Amino acid sequence: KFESRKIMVPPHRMTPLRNSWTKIYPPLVEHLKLQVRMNLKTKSVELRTNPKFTTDPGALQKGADFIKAFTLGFDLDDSIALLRLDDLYIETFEVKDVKTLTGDHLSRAIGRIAGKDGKTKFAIENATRTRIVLADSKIHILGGFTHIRMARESVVSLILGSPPGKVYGNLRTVASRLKER
Amino acid sequence: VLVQDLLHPTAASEARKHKLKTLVQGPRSYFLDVKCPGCLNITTVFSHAQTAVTCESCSTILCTPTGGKAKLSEGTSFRRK
Amino acid sequence: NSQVFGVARIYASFNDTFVHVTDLSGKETIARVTGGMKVKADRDESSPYAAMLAAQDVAAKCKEVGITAVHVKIRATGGTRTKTPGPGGQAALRALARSGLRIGRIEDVTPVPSDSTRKKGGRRGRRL
Amino acid sequence: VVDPFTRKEWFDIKAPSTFENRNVGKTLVNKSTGLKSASDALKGRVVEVCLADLQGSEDHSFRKIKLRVDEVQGKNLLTNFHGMDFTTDKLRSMVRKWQTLIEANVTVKTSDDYVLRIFAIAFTRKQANQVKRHSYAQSSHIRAIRKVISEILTKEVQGSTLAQLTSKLIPEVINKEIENATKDIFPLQNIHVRKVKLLKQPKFDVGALMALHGEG
RNA sequence: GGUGAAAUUCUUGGAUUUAUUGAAGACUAACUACUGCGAAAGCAUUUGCCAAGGACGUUUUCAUUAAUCAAGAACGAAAGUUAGGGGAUCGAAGAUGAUCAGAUACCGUCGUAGUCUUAACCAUAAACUAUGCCGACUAGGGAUCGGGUGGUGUUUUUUUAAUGACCCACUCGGCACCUUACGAGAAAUCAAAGUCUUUGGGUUCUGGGGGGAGUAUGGUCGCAAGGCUGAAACUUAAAGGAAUUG
Ligand SMILES: [Zn+2]
């Protein structure tokens, strides 16, 4: 009864993958105890489970979600926090999901989500205990369901054109009403 | 640079420049004396030819037009004169 | 080796999370449960908790009918909409894989258009 | 109040003999009562199964086959070929920035009066010494490659019926033929035929289907 | 279904969902880039037809035929007008709902014209590079697009000649990019916004403190909406821009 998940890796994420390879597979074979292989020819990562291992198909699901979360550009320790705690999820949506911006408007919306030196982005990074990743045009939010909903509302308000002062005030209000419970 | 002789440029730097942008502009083309194997006739063709020129002796082909120099046909003798 | 295979659609919308289990042919369904059937609050229908409860219920039902392994086809609402599965979909998938069913060939079948028709909101986006 | 799953019975669906593993799974249907037989409620179902479960190897993991159910006798329902598609993940992984996508399709007919629409795909590449970062192609190259691919696909389809076309498409010899033909024009990595689908069918002609089946 | 929460709506004639097939109109994702083309507006599926363009190459031909341009003329996004078609999506107007301190969450559903097209109108956009057009000179560097030249350079013919793809060097014409100040500027910044108090290459258009005012009136174009041209009386000591500091 061997069960396998075979998931691909984009090229720009494969060169950090092996660069962090020694930090990825040991817990997966020690704390979580699967078979993990890197088939470079098909550009994929393979996870296999067998009845010799621990009785946990959820461990295989967690490992698949671990690799799939890391391969989107996330950090390694945040992926570990995904691997241990079982409440964090990933949401993903494009800029054109909210409002069909084009040309320089999409670029300026990306710069509005990020902010100078990431500072604005760091704000939504802090007050919501989430993990925000900006791709070329799609954005990913990692965290609990209410937390990713809060981050989604904040970044949707950023896309539509609201200035960073209003989202700063709203973010401190939501953080105050969040940490009090 | 900034201390040199623009009147007598070196031949390598003179041949590296444009045909028009030379100190005295002149052509970079030449005329080829072509001997096709089918006969002994000699034909003076242009290097940058534009028409499929063909000599009157045995009348098959001499060259094919191309956007730069005309690409020659199969192996014929040609002298650069 | 003689394990009967079905296929499970996981529809992850922003208001509900459908879990559907059918046989290999797409007709002749076996068990369909939504997020609203397990939670009576009118606010937790799209929650991961309701998706987990629905996945547990449909796992019990599909174990009862006879099948024991399903290929998972997950999809969002798609089209001109978000076309990417939400956290209810991952919750239903994890709860299905947790309950001992053999899971293979997980594939996303979300409807992606070749630059189709317009979307609601009108030039200022869906104000959210 | 009625428990409808008790009156239903299971039937065993088996693949055509062209593939390696010709037993593909099970399906269930209601009991054949009056004025609604269990036969005619089954004669048109289309299943979709991955090619690996037909062939065993993991080199055919991205493809999948739609098989139409044609006949039924004694719990055994017999299928034929209806279409082939890639999975979405492989299609998304193939598309990469800083290279040129090429798509082509033709509609054609086999030896018998089948009608097929076939979609082939291709991408460009760099030949291991190219410092230039993208390697796009000019439009004349893309048009010539579309013409070559269309002519190869048409020639390789009308030369046989559907059986030898499936037997030629399983080991993907058409891709190597296209790579042989277009390597004098442009590099063209990652050549695949991304989709085939039936359009029109002739009369049923149960003899040909039972000639394709009937072994083992 | 729907929102922060509700309500309208559809449904035990089975809604939402899953599978097969058909019809309709619109649009061409991902490839998509500080890449291409076009006088600009603008232009992305394949194939065919028709004419058109630029750059390159030319020891072709005419020989000043040229640059800018009141008059006059072609085109000109979206919305809008007039008759026919088509009407899938979205949707001004309108219809209805809950309107709960706050909507930070001023929204929901249906839907008219419209969006699409044919035949005529209109001629405006932050129509922006907020930088007229033609010509000359002044600085380094790395990319990239189209053509051309050179390489007993690399690779695929099925035997290694040809062509294609790549690499290196040069050149012409492009879209651009990073640094700098011999210079310029109020400054942000500029290879032009330089070659300007050491002021003159050629030539069109425009402005002269702010309100009143794009207003009144006249003229003219347009079926209309409106467009083009366009004041004064009076009134005021400001108005404005560029950076630093909180
Ligand atoms: Zn000749």
UniProtKB/Swiss-Prot annotation, chain A:
Location(s) in or outside the cell: Cytoplasm; Nucleus, Nucleolus
Record carries keyword RNA-binding: yes
Source superkingdom: Eukaryota
GO CC terms in record: 90S preribosome; cytoplasm; nucleolus; nucleus
Listed GO biological process terms: endonucleolytic cleavage in ITS1 to separate SSU-rRNA from 5.8S rRNA and LSU-rRNA from tricistronic rRNA transcript (SSU-rRNA, 5.8S rRNA, LSU-rRNA); endonucleolytic cleavage to generate mature 5'-end of SSU-rRNA from (SSU-rRNA, 5.8S rRNA, LSU-rRNA); proteasome assembly; ribosomal small subunit export from nucleus; ribosome assembly
Keywords: Cytoplasm, Nucleus, Phosphoprotein, Ribosome biogenesis, RNA-binding
Function: Required for small ribosomal subunit (SSU) synthesis. Has a role in the processing of early nucleolar and late cytoplasmic pre-RNA species. Recruits DIM1 to nucleolar pre-RNAs. Indirectly required for cleavage at the A2 site of the 20S pre-rRNA, forming 18S rRNA, and at A1 and A2 sites of other pre-rRNAs.
Identification of the protein by name: Pre-rRNA-processing protein PNO1
Species, as recorded: Saccharomyces cerevisiae (strain ATCC 204508 / S288c)
Range of the intact protein held here: 93 to 273 of 274
UniProtKB/Swiss-Prot annotation, chain B:
One Pfam family matching this protein: Ribosomal_S27e
Record carries keyword Cytoplasm: yes
InterPro entries for this protein: Ribosomal_eS27, Ribosomal_eS27_Zn-bd_dom_sf, Ribosomal_zn-bd
Annotated GO CC locations: cytoplasm; cytosol; cytosolic small ribosomal subunit
Positions of post-translational S-methylcysteine modification: C39
Domain of life: Eukaryota
Range of residues in the leader sequence: none
Keyword annotations: Cytoplasm, Metal-binding, Methylation, Ribonucleoprotein, Ribosomal protein, Zinc, Zinc-finger
GO MF term list: RNA binding; structural constituent of ribosome; zinc ion binding
Main location: cytoplasm
Modification after translation: The N-terminus is not modified.
Cofactor(s) the record lists: Zn(2+)
GO biological process terms, semicolon-separated: maturation of SSU-rRNA from tricistronic rRNA transcript (SSU-rRNA, 5.8S rRNA, LSU-rRNA); ribosomal small subunit assembly; translation
Keyword Zinc annotated: yes
Cellular compartment(s): Cytoplasm
Zinc finger feature spans (C4-type): 36-58
Co-factor remark: Binds 1 zinc ion per subunit.
Additional record remark: Present with 43300 molecules/cell in log phase SD medium. There are 2 genes for eS27 in yeast.
The protein's assembly and partners: Component of the small ribosomal subunit (SSU). Mature yeast ribosomes consist of a small (40S) and a large (60S) subunit. The 40S small subunit contains 1 molecule of ribosomal RNA (18S rRNA) and 33 different proteins (encoded by 57 genes). The large 60S subunit contains 3 rRNA molecules (25S, 5.8S and 5S rRNA) and 46 different proteins (encoded by 81 genes).
Family: Belongs to the eukaryotic ribosomal protein eS27 family.
PANTHER family: 40S RIBOSOMAL PROTEIN S27
Protein name: Small ribosomal subunit protein eS27A
Annotated source species: Saccharomyces cerevisiae (strain ATCC 204508 / S288c) (Baker's yeast)
Gene: RPS27A
UniProtKB/Swiss-Prot annotation, chain C:
PANTHER family: 40S RIBOSOMAL PROTEIN S14/30S RIBOSOMAL PROTEIN S11 (PTHR11759)
Other remarks in the entry: Present with 29600 molecules/cell in log phase SD medium. There are 2 genes for uS11 in yeast.
The entry's keywords: Acetylation, Cytoplasm, Nucleus, Ribonucleoprotein, Ribosomal protein, Ribosome biogenesis, rRNA processing
Physiological role: Component of the ribosome, a large ribonucleoprotein complex responsible for the synthesis of proteins in the cell. The small ribosomal subunit (SSU) binds messenger RNAs (mRNAs) and translates the encoded message by selecting cognate aminoacyl-transfer RNA (tRNA) molecules. The large subunit (LSU) contains the ribosomal catalytic site termed the peptidyl transferase center (PTC), which catalyzes the formation of peptide bonds, thereby polymerizing the amino acids delivered by tRNAs into a polypeptide chain.
UniProt similarity note: Belongs to the universal ribosomal protein uS11 family.
SUPFAM superfamilies: Translational machinery components
UniProt keyword annotation of Oxidoreductase present: no
Residue ranges that the Swiss-Prot or TrEMBL entry lists as coiled coil: none
Region listing for Disordered, in residue ranges: 108-128
NCBIfam families per the UniProt record, alphabetical: PRK09607.1 (NF007176)
GO term, biological process aspect, one: translation
Subcellular location(s) of the protein: Cytoplasm; Nucleus, Nucleolus
Zinc recorded as keyword: no
PTM characteristics: N-terminally acetylated by acetyltransferase NatA.
InterPro entries named among the record's database cross-references: Ribosomal_uS11 (IPR001971), Ribosomal_uS11_CS (IPR018102), Ribosomal_uS11_sf (IPR036967)
A GO cellular component entry from the record: nucleoplasm
Stored Pfam families: Ribosomal_S11 (PF00411)
Comp. bias (Basic residues): 119-128
A Gene Ontology molecular function term of the record: mRNA binding
PROSITE patterns: RIBOSOMAL_S11
Protein name, entry field: Small ribosomal subunit protein uS11A
Organism: Saccharomyces cerevisiae (strain ATCC 204508 / S288c)
Swiss-Prot record, chain D:
Post-translational modification: N-terminally acetylated by acetyltransferase NatA.
Record's keyword terms, sorted: Acetylation, Cytoplasm, Isopeptide bond, Phosphoprotein, Ribonucleoprotein, Ribosomal protein, Ubl conjugation
Keyword set includes Flavoprotein: no
Gene Ontology biological process terms from the UniProt entry: cytoplasmic translation; maturation of SSU-rRNA from tricistronic rRNA transcript (SSU-rRNA, 5.8S rRNA, LSU-rRNA)
Additional notes on this entry: Present with 92400 molecules/cell in log phase SD medium.
Localization (cell): Cytoplasm
Residues of the full protein shown: 20 to 235 of 255
One function term, GO molecular function aspect: structural constituent of ribosome
Protein name: Small ribosomal subunit protein eS1A
Predominant cellular place of this UniProt entry's protein: cytoplasm
Oligomer status and interactors: Component of the small ribosomal subunit (SSU). Mature yeast ribosomes consist of a small (40S) and a large (60S) subunit. The 40S small subunit contains 1 molecule of ribosomal RNA (18S rRNA) and 33 different proteins (encoded by 57 genes). The large 60S subunit contains 3 rRNA molecules (25S, 5.8S and 5S rRNA) and 46 different proteins (encoded by 81 genes). eS1 interacts directly with uS11 and eS26, which form part of the mRNA exit tunnel.
Family recorded in the similarity comment: Belongs to the eukaryotic ribosomal protein eS1 family.
Ubl conjugation is among the record's keywords: yes
Biological classification of the source: Eukaryota, Fungi, Dikarya, Ascomycota, Saccharomycotina
Organism this protein belongs to: Saccharomyces cerevisiae (strain ATCC 204508 / S288c)
Entry's Gene Ontology cellular component terms: 90S preribosome; cytosol; cytosolic small ribosomal subunit
